[PDB]
Structure formats: structure tokens, C-alpha cells
Task: structure prediction
Amino acid sequence: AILTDRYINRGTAFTMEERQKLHILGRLPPVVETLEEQVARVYGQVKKYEKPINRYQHLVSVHSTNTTLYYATILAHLEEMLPIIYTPTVGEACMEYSHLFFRERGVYFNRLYKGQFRNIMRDAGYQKVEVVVITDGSRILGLGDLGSNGIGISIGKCSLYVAGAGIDPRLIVPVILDVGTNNERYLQDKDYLGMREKRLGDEEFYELLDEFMEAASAEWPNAVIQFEDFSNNHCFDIMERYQKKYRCFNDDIQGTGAVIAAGFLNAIKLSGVSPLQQRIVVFGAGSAAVGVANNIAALAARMYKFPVQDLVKTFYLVDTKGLVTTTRGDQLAAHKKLLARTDVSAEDSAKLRTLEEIVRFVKPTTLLGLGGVGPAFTEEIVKMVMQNTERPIIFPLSNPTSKAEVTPENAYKWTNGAAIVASGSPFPPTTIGGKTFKPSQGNNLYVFPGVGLGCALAQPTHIPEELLLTASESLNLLTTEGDLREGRLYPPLEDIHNISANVATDVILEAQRMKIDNNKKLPRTRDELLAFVKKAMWKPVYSG
Amino acid sequence: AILTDRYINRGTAFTMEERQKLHILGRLPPVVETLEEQVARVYGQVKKYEKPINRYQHLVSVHSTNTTLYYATILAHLEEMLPIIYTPTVGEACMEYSHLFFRERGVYFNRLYKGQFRNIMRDAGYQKVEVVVITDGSRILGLGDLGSNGIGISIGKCSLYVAGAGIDPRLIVPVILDVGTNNERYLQDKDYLGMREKRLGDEEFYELLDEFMEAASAEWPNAVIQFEDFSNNHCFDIMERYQKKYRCFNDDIQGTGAVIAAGFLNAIKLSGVSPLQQRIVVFGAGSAAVGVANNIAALAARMYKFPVQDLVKTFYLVDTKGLVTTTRGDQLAAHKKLLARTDVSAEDSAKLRTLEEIVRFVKPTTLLGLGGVGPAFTEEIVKMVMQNTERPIIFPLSNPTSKAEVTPENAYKWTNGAAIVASGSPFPPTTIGGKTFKPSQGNNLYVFPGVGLGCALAQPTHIPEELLLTASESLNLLTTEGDLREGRLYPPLEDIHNISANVATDVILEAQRMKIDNNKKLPRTRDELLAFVKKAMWKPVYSG
Ligand SMILES: O=C(Nc1cccc(S(=O)(=O)Nc2ccc(OC(F)F)cc2)c1)c1cc(F)cc(F)c1
Ligand SMILES: O=C(Nc1cccc(S(=O)(=O)Nc2ccc(OC(F)F)cc2)c1)c1cc(F)cc(F)c1
Result:
């Protein structure tokens, strides 16, 4: 009952006296270790494997045997483990090694179980669920439809709430809504265990997802519902359909913009060039890219009370046709109209098509890379931004490292260390003339865990944009005057518990201000509330 | 309680109606599979890995989740899985990947627990244990001292009793007696979890092993104790110390000789050249090699009632100095004296040192490779044996494939298909002139499971040499006139359950004849007893 229960198993951390008392003497090799020693040992076992997928496979066996030791190991080595336990290793494990998720506790829905969703949730036998991560395996980036195998994405995401914000590992639920797959290999694969049919149309999709939201609201009323890795045809419409009626958010949309805005406003503080003096090229004009721009504007308005109209005029949106302007002659998509230049002539628009000529005309102080079309921030373009500011802000956020607009190394080299860089991936430091530079990674881990922990404690009726904006500001303000002097845009990733507790505290205070909080037990003053939030967090230490 | 219990979990083999009844609908992806389908799926998952160690790692995760599916997969693919789940992959997993055994149910003894062995066995909480495999990690071949990590050897060996003879997986216990290690890397390794000291001397070794045998005899009175992978300094002395007093055997010593004798007498039947006409070079003169020779003699005496003295005179023993003779001038080790030629002059002995000149003088009809010194059965030597018999019997039994005296391919090539070959490793078939040849593999799996199953049912007071000799004869007689016409020396490995049931039946009848059997419930006639033994075997099928 002790060794075989992964939540209370301590393995070699059981003392000789504990082993005798628990009648497990001789069930373990004789060495007694501390958790710190067990972590160092597990870290050596992980590094004995060269390939990410094999490191993940090892970590899965640790999680299945000693859950405290698993989470202890992730927190000791967070920056290094992140690429293994989530993007991009987790999607590779879903696509080709889906058996790595068979043993994990999750919930599988499909059309065959229509009208039974509530019964299936009841039967799962959870207590006071706090977080539910749901995907359909469609993929936000629309690469590698995973179908049913998308369960691995929900499982990996749930583990980041536990590690990042101390969501108790028993109070989190990974969910796959299998509405089919358009993955041709899977549709023909004898070993695919999911619904063997093309993805359902919107009407049936929403019937099943409505039943899921309603069942969850009734059976898991304390839960936050987080949408993960839904395709663009659904992810925005899902939030529009449910944001007011259920306690839900989408990390890809709302988390990404909260994190990027926080980093960007710290880049502005370091740059010299204040927010109304910034001239920002937004390379890429999808709904997501425009969402990030709007989140930057909203955050600058909150922190500084500049008129938002004036902040929107700092943005120069570039789509596949060129600079988005009112004089260009095309009918603009709704999301592009708000950021469209009104101050550029038809004749100038005609000559603003390539990024090099747009940069030469706009004279930007910032390049935001949200383009997903490879390395567009060329040496020539970086050299022109150096004419417009002493401290170019360059954010190559497109993933992976090959789709990225520019390497941090190149940005630092070409600017001789002047570039302020945030990345969507970890990069090693660059040294120029004995001076060391390292990009700030805008990882989504900075925001979703603290939103999850704040929404779990506060029990708000719903998650309005105010709570994401509060989380974005909280994150910005956690970057210390010391961190800022060393060129960091974010508090350090390894301090994620403190980050999450602060973000959670600020989200709770906002829910309290709006009177949407249903938990009347919580402190209503920041210092006392922060102390309370920290004590509520589950910690990967042996407890009893 | 259902999915999380590896003994009753069926995974996708639970029907839709079962999943609803058991309240696990939505705990599994929706496809329902038969066990045969699950086996094909697992077999594909195993072959997705290139390296043996990675295939083993996958099979460990299947065993931890669905034990019935694990054993079903091994039995469907036995010949292919054998090298992965035991020798030589298992020793590599012990040496460098010992974490693969952490989750497995075993028992760890050492000097720190002196006087507690019985309490530790009681606490392990087993019912009516049938088989116990114990090692100290010293290694029969004295390569790669594993210390505590030798637990993996006992675990792999126990799984071969379950797969080979349907020992119920709940009624088998893997044991490590950690009496230290002489592995210098381990003694310095911060992550070694065993007793960090050089191996104990003989007096303390036997104090601890005596306590083990006595504790086991009292707490697990129905068990057979099998010694596995003990070093030569102890393995023979252990059997001398315990064979009469406890229900125990050593598979390396007693199993190997039983299997090789059975194959060799079938090679003699195929050869034309009858046992008293055979002239057998025994290349290698260790205790083990001489044990095998004596087991061949004892089996030929039992099956054919030739005087054993006359069979012993068919053997020409070759040690590192040359042909073992009474006229050679050295003082012979006790085990070499029995097989020493008395019919070779001092002057002939002086000129009988190289294997090529011994073969030229002896004119053997058989070469037995038990030498462990690489490829000594050269083309020239094989060509000389062709002068002495139409059907040379060539047995390169030294492991691994590099220590082997000759490849089966070479033996078949050089003899143009006339060679009768048994190997200690699996080999692919060889085709010569459109005719296909494949060596017979003398795997230890043919004997120990059936001895374990016979001794579990019969509950003999002890395991005298009569029961091994009976098992050796049983195995020989299971090679059908059809198998023999196709050149096979052994019944087919994939029929291991039937083999084990027959071996077990013949062992029981022998224990009954000697009146050492303590189980009075068993049939005493072969047909009825075989039917009973088959029904008692655990089968990897879903039962309830
Ligand atoms: O926990 C058990 N044994 C253990 C033996 C050495 C060490 C440890 S540990 O917990 O201190 N470290 C550890 C663990 C599992 C890792 O994952 C992958 F390697 F197995 C990796 C490290 C644990 C255990 C659990 C059972 F359910 C049954 C049982 F008989 C033993
Ligand atoms: O058994 C479970 N799920 C399962 C899901 C798909 C398929 C199967 S299976 O049993 O039909 N096949 C299978 C299994 C484990 C393999 O090992 C390595 F891949 F996990 C390999 C194949 C089983 C299970 C067990 C739990 F303890 C909790 C839980 F939530 C689910």
C-alpha cells in the first residue's frame, strides 16, 4: 500500500526505522537517501539518455513510481527539463510513442458517449478538482493532427500546473475530446485506438463540447477549464462561446499575449525609448499576432494611463501583402483593421511590400517576430533598426528555432550587444568582447499556473480579460531592479513557485475587486493573501 | 482498483459493456481489442525501438501495467524476445540501467539484516510461494560483478518460470543476497544503492546464506530455491552444502548439463554413429564442462543401459595444456581424473598439446565446444572430423557468439550440410545448394521451468540428481520423429508450455518412485498426471 502508491512512496528516502515500522525492510536496496540525493540520482539517470524522447520515457517511469521525486526533479532542473516534459518533445511522444500516456489518469470523451459525459466524470472518482486541461488534438499550429493521442498534451500541460503553481497532483484532470482526426496515417493505422473518422463538423463539435462544459461545471464546479492546442478554426470561437458562462481560458491565445506583453514593457523600460516613442513592426498579422499587439497596448494603458488610441498608433502591422494600411486597396480582415495605418498614402502603400523597404520607411525601434515564415530579420534589417534607437528591441517569437525571425546570437552580434531580445525557445548565452548576453525566454509557464492557482482559490464565476491583464502586469512587476540591471525581462524561471504565488495573489485581488470571487475565506489585503496562497500550494517534499 | 492492478487490468480488451459495468468508460481510448490484437500492437511498439535495452525498457512498462498482456506477448514471440528479457540484455540492464528493476517486487538481504531474514520474508506478504530465484550478483562467468544490481537477474529468471512453465506470477520471488561487490566502479559510484564494501569472506557468506535457506524453508516451505549466476568459487560448494537439506538446484550447473545431454543424444541418433562408436573431444576442462560430459554419460546409461565406464571412455578431455591423460606428467585436478585417458603413452601425450594435433590423433566424430577461448574449431579441424564420420556432431556452446568455437554457418558450409549443430545462442538458418540448415539452440528454458513446476506440485523433500536426469531424458524423448527428420535436436521452443508440462510430469513420477514427494493429491499414472499438470499451469489469458 506504501511502495505501490506513487503519491506516498518515498523509495530510498524511507529511513531504516521507517522501513522496519512499515514492514518494507528488504523491499528496497539498503542505502538511505534524502530527496535532494534522490533528485541528483534521477538527474544522472535522465542524462544517461541522449535523445529527448528517451529522457521523457525515463521521467514517465519516475512519475509512475514516486510522484514527489518526479516533481522535485523537474523543479531542481526546470529550464533543462521544460523542452523534454512539454513542447516540443511531448508532441513527438504523442505522435509516435503514445503508449507513454497509457498508464496516466485521464478522461476520454467522443460521440459514442453522448449524454453520458456527466456519468463518466462522476465515475472518474476525483475530489474537488481545481484544473482541467482539454484538447481535441487538432493543434494550434495545425501541424501533426494527434487525434485521441492529444491526451498526451493535456497530461503534459496538467503536470506544468502541478510543478509551476503547486496544484495538488490529485486535483488536476487531463481530457481528450476525440471528435476524430484528419491524420491520414492514423486513419489507416491498425494500432490507432481513437475514433477512426475525419473530424466532426462544427455543429456536432459544439454539441459534444457544450455537453463537456455543462457536465464539468456540474460535476467539477471548483475547476478552471483550460483549452490547449485547439486549431484556429475553433480556438477563438470556443472562447467567444464560453468565456462568460464558464470558468475557462485558452493558454495559447490569452497566456501567450500576457507573457509577451510583460516582457515587452520591460524591454521598453531598458531601451530608453518610452512606449509612446516606440515604433513597432509587428511581423505577422494572424489573429494571434494582433491579439499580442492588443495585449501590449492594454498593458501599457493599465501601467502608465497613456490613451490606448495613442499606444495603438505605435504599431506597424505587416501581413503577407506588406504594411497593413487603409490606403492599400484590399478589403482588410476584421482583426487587421484596428492596427491599419491611416497615415500612409496609397502611393507609399504600393512601395511597402518587402520587410526591408517597410523597415527603411517606418524607422522602427522594435521588431516583433510573430510571422511563422523563417528568418526575416536579416542583418540589413537589424542594421537599419540601429539607426533608429541605441537599444533595438528584437523579439523572434516564431517556433521552432528554424521558423524564428533571427537567432539571439546574430541579434547580439549585429548590434554589438545593444539588442534587447526575448525568444519563444531557450538559447545559450552569447559573449561579445568579454560581455555576456542571454535572451529572455517568454515561456507560457510564467502565467497559466498562477491564473490556475488564483482561479482555484478565488473560484470566480468566470475569467474576464481583466484577470489575464492583472496576471500580465503582476509578471512584469516581478522583474526586480537587479534582474533589469542584468538585462532580464522576466523573473527567473526557477523561481516559478514565488512567481505563481504572486500572479495568483494579484488575480485573486482583481476577482475580489470585480466581486466575481465565490471563495469568502481568502484574505483581501496583498501581504496576508500572498502568505495564504504560498501555504496552499502543494510542494514536492515528503509530507506523510 | 481494476486498471491500476496489473494482474486484472485488461486495458482495451475490456468490452464497452464491461467498461460501463466497471465504471471505467472514458478511462480508456474507445477501440476494443482482443488479447491477440493487443499482442500484435505491443509487438509493433517493441520493434519501434532498435536497441535491445530500449525494447526491454518498453516490455518493463507493459509488465508494470498489464501483466497478462506482457506474458501473452513473450509467448507469441518467444525465440525473438528471449535475448531481450534475459541473457544477454538483462545483465546490460543490471549493469547500466538498474533503475529498470526499482518498481519490481523482490527481496533484498545483506549483513545489516542478520537475524531478521525470516521477519523480512513474512513481511513480504506472499501466499504459498512456489519458486524463489536467488543471486549475489557475483556472475557464473565472473564478468561484470553486479552486486545489489544482481536483483535484475533474479527478476528476469523468475519471469522465465512464469512464461515457460506457468508458475503463477504472484507465487514467484526474486531475491538478491547482497554480500558486497568487487565492482570498482560501483564501490566509487555515488548512485550505487547496495552494500558499499568488497565481497564478504566465505565464513560470513555462508552464515548469511545459511540464514536465508533456513528462513525460506520455514516461511516459504512449498518453494523451490534456485541458485542463479553464482561465481565458481561458491556455486558448486553451495549445492554440496544444501542439496540434501533443502529443495534447491542451480540452473547454470544442473540445467545446462540436462539440456546439452538431451540435444547431444538426439545428435547421436541422427549421426548414424551410435554412443559407444562416438569419439568425443571435450574442448574445455572446467568443472562445468566435465559436469556436462558426465551428464551425457549418465543420460546414455539411463536410456540405453550401456555400462557407464564404457561411455566415459568415449570422451577425450582437452584442457589448456592439451589432451588430459594419466601419462602426461602433471598432477590432475580432481574433476579431470575421471575423464583422463589411461590408453595414451607419455610420448604420445607430449605430442598432444594443440587442438589440431589432438584431433588428428583422436579421430573424433564429435567436437564439444565448452572452452571459452574463441573460435578453436577451425576449417582444418572440421575437415578432419569429416574423415571420421559422415555426420560430424559440432556443438559450439561457449557464449557470446565471439567466444563460440565455430559459427553454425561455417560448420554447415565446411561439411556441405553434414554437420549436426547445437548452439548456446540463436542463429539464422543457412542454405547450401537449396537445402536449409538451422542449428538447434540448447536454451536452459527447456529444463528449469519444468523442474520448477514438477517440484512445486510434487513438493519433494529435496531435488536429487535423479530428478535432473529424468528431466534431461523427458526433454530428449519430446523431440518427435518429425522434428528429428527435419534435423531438430529439441522440441520447438515456442511449445514451451507442453515441454514444461511433460518435463514436470516426468519429474513428479520420479519423485513418486523415490517416495520424496509430499503432495499426496497428484495422479500417479503419466496420462492422468500430464492432464493435471497442464490444468495447474497459469496461462496468460484474461480469466476474471
Ligand atoms: O519505489 C520502489 N522501489 C525503489 C527502489 C530504488 C529506488 C527508488 S527511488 O524512489 O528512491 N528512486 C526512483 C524510483 C523510480 C524511478 O523511476 C524508474 F527508474 F523506475 C527512478 C528513481 C525506489 C518500489 C515501488 C513499488 F511499487 C514496488 C516496489 F517493490 C518498490
Ligand atoms: O491500462 C491502462 N490504460 C491503457 C490504455 C491503452 C491501452 C492499454 S493496453 O493494456 O491495452 N495495452 C498496453 C498497456 C501498457 C503498455 O505498456 C506501456 F506502453 F505503457 C503497452 C500496451 C491500457 C491504464 C492503467 C492504469 F493504471 C490507469 C489508467 F488510467 C489506465
Notes: The pocket of SZJ (ligand 2) is lined by residues A 99, 102-103, 105; B 3-4, 9, 11-12, 27-29, 38, 42, 61-62, 65-66, 69 (CB under 6 Å).
